[PDB]
Scaffold this active site. Structure first.
Site, PDB file in Angstrom:
ATOM      1  N   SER A  91       0.795  -0.719  -0.143  1.00 59.50           N
ATOM      2  CA  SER A  91      -0.217  -0.106   0.174  1.00 59.50           C
ATOM      3  C   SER A  91       0.760   0.792   0.271  1.00 59.50           C
ATOM      4  CB  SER A  91      -0.964   0.157   1.110  1.00 59.50           C
ATOM      5  OG  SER A  91      -2.402   1.097   1.318  1.00 59.50           O
ATOM      6  N   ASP A 135     -10.515  -4.897  -4.843  1.00 57.01           N
ATOM      7  CA  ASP A 135      -9.246  -4.168  -3.292  1.00 57.01           C
ATOM      8  C   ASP A 135      -9.885  -2.924  -3.645  1.00 57.01           C
ATOM      9  OD1 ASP A 135      -7.644  -2.668  -2.398  1.00 57.01           O
ATOM     10  OD2 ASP A 135      -6.226  -3.176  -3.098  1.00 57.01           O
ATOM     11  N   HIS A 143      -7.226  -5.577   0.651  1.00 62.13           N
ATOM     12  CA  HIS A 143      -5.766  -4.467   0.598  1.00 62.13           C
ATOM     13  C   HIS A 143      -5.179  -5.175   1.331  1.00 62.13           C
ATOM     14  CE1 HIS A 143      -4.556  -0.823  -0.930  1.00 62.13           C
ATOM     15  NE2 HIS A 143      -4.401  -0.914   0.408  1.00 62.13           N
TER      16      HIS A 143
HETATM   17  O1  LIG Z   1      -3.285   4.147   2.437  1.00 64.41           O
HETATM   18  C1  LIG Z   1      -4.099   4.232   1.599  1.00 64.41           C
HETATM   19  C2  LIG Z   1      -5.214   5.071   1.074  1.00 64.41           C
HETATM   20  C3  LIG Z   1      -5.618   3.738   0.552  1.00 64.41           C
HETATM   21  C4  LIG Z   1      -5.449   2.708   1.041  1.00 64.41           C
HETATM   22  C5  LIG Z   1      -6.782   1.669   1.489  1.00 64.41           C
HETATM   23  C6  LIG Z   1      -6.434   2.799   3.094  1.00 64.41           C
HETATM   24  C7  LIG Z   1      -5.912   2.210   4.542  1.00 64.41           C
HETATM   25  C8  LIG Z   1      -6.152   3.650   5.113  1.00 64.41           C
HETATM   26  C9  LIG Z   1      -7.129   4.059   5.713  1.00 64.41           C
HETATM   27  C10 LIG Z   1      -6.799   5.098   6.445  1.00 64.41           C
HETATM   28  C11 LIG Z   1      -6.820   4.660   7.079  1.00 64.41           C
HETATM   29  C12 LIG Z   1      -6.826   5.231   8.808  1.00 64.41           C
HETATM   30  C13 LIG Z   1      -7.027   6.262   9.012  1.00 64.41           C
HETATM   31  C14 LIG Z   1      -7.608   7.216   8.088  1.00 64.41           C
HETATM   32  C15 LIG Z   1      -7.723   6.229   6.634  1.00 64.41           C
HETATM   33  C16 LIG Z   1      -7.684   4.364   3.916  1.00 64.41           C
HETATM   34  C17 LIG Z   1      -7.164   3.467   2.980  1.00 64.41           C
HETATM   35  N1  LIG Z   1      -9.163   3.853   2.278  1.00 64.41           N
HETATM   36  O2  LIG Z   1      -9.582   4.924   2.314  1.00 64.41           O
HETATM   37  O3  LIG Z   1      -9.255   3.269   1.817  1.00 64.41           O
HETATM   38  O4  LIG Z   1      -4.092   2.317   1.598  1.00 64.41           O
END
Ligand SMILES: O=C1C=C[C@H](Cc2ccc(-c3ccccc3)cc2[N+](=O)[O-])O1
Length: 268
Positions: free
Chosen positions: A95, A217, A246
């Site tokens: 990621s 994903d 993911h």
């Molecule tokens: O860093 C990334 C962006 C997109 C993908 C998946 C993803 C990972 C992390 C978060 C997230 C975690 C903690 C706080 C706020 C947001 C949100 C996503 N998402 O919206 O999809 O990985």
């Protein structure tokens, strides 16, 4: 180890020149690699580290200015590599860590022999000629939910990100590591990641890249993988995996780990 290794929970397993470094994505930590590492330790020196701001890391060390863009994380990665006297490594980036590795390799291409990405994306936000997966209004409702009630947001977000069965061990683990993040830090890192745009530097990459992703994903449409393949400036290969989620190396290791291992172990 030194302060920067302790601060990032650096583990080093094995010796030898042949080295693999594994960087994790937002919301998890180095434990996301638990199903991959047993297959690597017999042939590689294995380096694990946590990104600053993970729930396993000291919040006093989270410098909101340093981590206001992705370059702050790439400087950390380079410092760890230099501290460990690592001259060259295979970097496996999950990621956001995929693009942190790309950034580091722009400054120090000598340090990376290849980059294996998992669930990577250079841009999440749609525009009229690029499908990233999220409209700006999607993001707003995300930061609004996180800011409103973090804990509730963690419980809701974890099964959608991990995918697969909602009762799984991986949904359990991820919702936990998500929730151990300090809510202001989670918010700050969310903004940095979701407002990132790595598309314009891809042509300057000079390290071969393997582009792996779940076919399903929530955060990475399959066309993103093809975009990366078409615009990266070095040799690259895509392999879309018959998996959901993911963090597939955690949630579906039976189908996902053999693919990752093929791309680690074999060159283009
Ligand atoms: O860093 C990334 C962006 C997109 C993908 C998946 C993803 C990972 C992390 C978060 C997230 C975690 C903690 C706080 C706020 C947001 C949100 C996503 N998402 O919206 O999809 O990985």
């Amino acid at each position: 180890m030194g302060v920067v290794e302790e601060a990032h929970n650096v583990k080093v397993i094995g010796s030898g020149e042949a080295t693999i470094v594994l960087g994790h994505g937002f919301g998890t930590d180095q434990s996301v690699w638990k199903h991959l590492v047993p297959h690597l330790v017999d042939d590689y020196r294995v380096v694990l580290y946590d990104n600053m701001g993970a729930g396993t890391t000291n919040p006093d060390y989270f410098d909101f200015d340093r981590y206001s863009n992705l370059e702050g994380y790439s400087f950390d990665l380079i410092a760890i590599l230099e501290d460990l006297k690592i001259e060259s490594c295979i970097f496996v980036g999950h990621s956001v860590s995929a693009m942190i590795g790309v950034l580091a390799s722009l400054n120090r291409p000598d340090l990376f022999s290849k980059i294996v990405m998992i669930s990577a994306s250079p841009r999440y936000v749609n525009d009229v000629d690029y499908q990233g997966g999220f409209e700006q209004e999607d993001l707003n409702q995300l930061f609004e939910a996180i800011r409103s009630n973090y804990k509730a947001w963690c419980l809701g977000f974890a099964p959608l990100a991990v995918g697969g069965d909602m009762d799984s061990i991986a949904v359990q683990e991820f919702s936990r590591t998500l929730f151990n993040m300090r809510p202001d830090i989670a918010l700050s890192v969310g903004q940095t990641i979701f407002q990132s745009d790595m598309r314009q530097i891809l042509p300057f990459v000079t390290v071969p890249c393997h582009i792996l992703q779940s076919v399903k994903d929530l955060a990475v449409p399959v066309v993103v993988s093809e975009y990366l393949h078409a615009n990266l400036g070095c040799e690259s290969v895509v392999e879309v995996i018959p998996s959901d989620g993911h963090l597939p190396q955690l949630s579906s290791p039976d189908s996902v780990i053999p693919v990752i291992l093929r791309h680690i172990r074999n060159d283009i």
